[PDB]
Amino acid sequence: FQQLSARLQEAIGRLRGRGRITEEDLKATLREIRRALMDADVNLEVTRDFVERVREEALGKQVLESLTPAEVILATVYEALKEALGGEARLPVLKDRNLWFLVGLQGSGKTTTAAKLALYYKGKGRRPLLVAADTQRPAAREQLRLLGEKVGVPVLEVMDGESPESIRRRVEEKARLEARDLILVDTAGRLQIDEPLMGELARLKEVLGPDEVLLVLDAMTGQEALSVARAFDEKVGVTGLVLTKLDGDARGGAALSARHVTGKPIYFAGLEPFYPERLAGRILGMG
Ligand SMILES: [Mg+2]
Predict the structure, then answer these.
(1) TM spans, by residue?
(2) What is the rounded CA–CA span in Å between residue 39 and residue 180?
(3) 133, 248, 281, 283: which sits with the fewest CB atoms below 10 Å from its CB?
């Protein structure tokens, strides 16, 4: 998160080699951190809580008596970033059979993520089945067919206007014949959220009964990504998130605000498992 990393590092760096710092020195730093977070598109309330968390913790660490307050602030900011990011790494719970939905807008990288996820679990010994569930657009189904072909994972393409009941029947049949134990359903991706889309997704959910509903989000959209996350959760109901294009995000607002705003864990980063602790370190220039 380029710009956030630099600002945070410069802020902590300013207190380096000054001996003990004053009360206003601390407040100044806290103000630099707050401004750094707002610019990174971190939610207003999340930013507010972050700065207070660092204040309370640092004071608890006797920061004003410290001869190396910069180290105390460093550790405190690291801890706050780690927690904001999710705290500890989390992954979906696999069982005998699993059917998960991959939901998100067109452009979130939902379809490529579906294939990437299948390859990831195949490597762990699972037998995935990709399901191209867009009942209106053949091109979207073809894209996943091609992707599955490349990653060596089977793809079931629904037909135009196929009912949720027919989709369930065919999916169940293929899974039985091919001993598939992880079904990844790539739902319809559209440029914007419209009620008809959400209604079909909600219906498809009632019929297929997925164990997990993964919302794929383009990290580069910032807070907007969480607005989308709220909508999808209210209309369909999500269980976890996948943030793509993290390398392009010089900010980090979405990743840093997700837990607080949505209450949903970030399972994967666009692809490998999401590691809060590892990213908190990289943000501070140590990763
Ligand atoms: Mg219902």
Answers:
(1) none
(2) 45
(3) 248
Containing structural domain, residue 73:
1-89
> Which among 42, 65, 89 is the end of a domain?
89
Instruction: Confirm whether residue 106 is marked as ligand binding.
Output: yes
209 is in an annotated binding site: no
Rounded CA-CA distance 226/11 in Å is 27
CA of 190 to the centre of ligand 1 (A): 21
Cα 73 to middle of ligand 1, angstroms:
48
Q: Does 278 fall in a domain?
A: no
- What resolution in angstroms does the PDB record give? 2.0
Residue 217: beta bridge partners? 243
| Pairing outcome for strands 128-132 and 98-103 | unpaired
Q: What is the tally of helices (H) and strands (E) in the chain?
A: 11, 8
Neighbouring residues of 103: CB distance < 8 A, sequence distance ≥ 6: 110, 187, 201, 213, 214, 215, 216, 232, 236, 238
Asked whether residue 108 is marked as a ligand-binding residue, the answer is yes
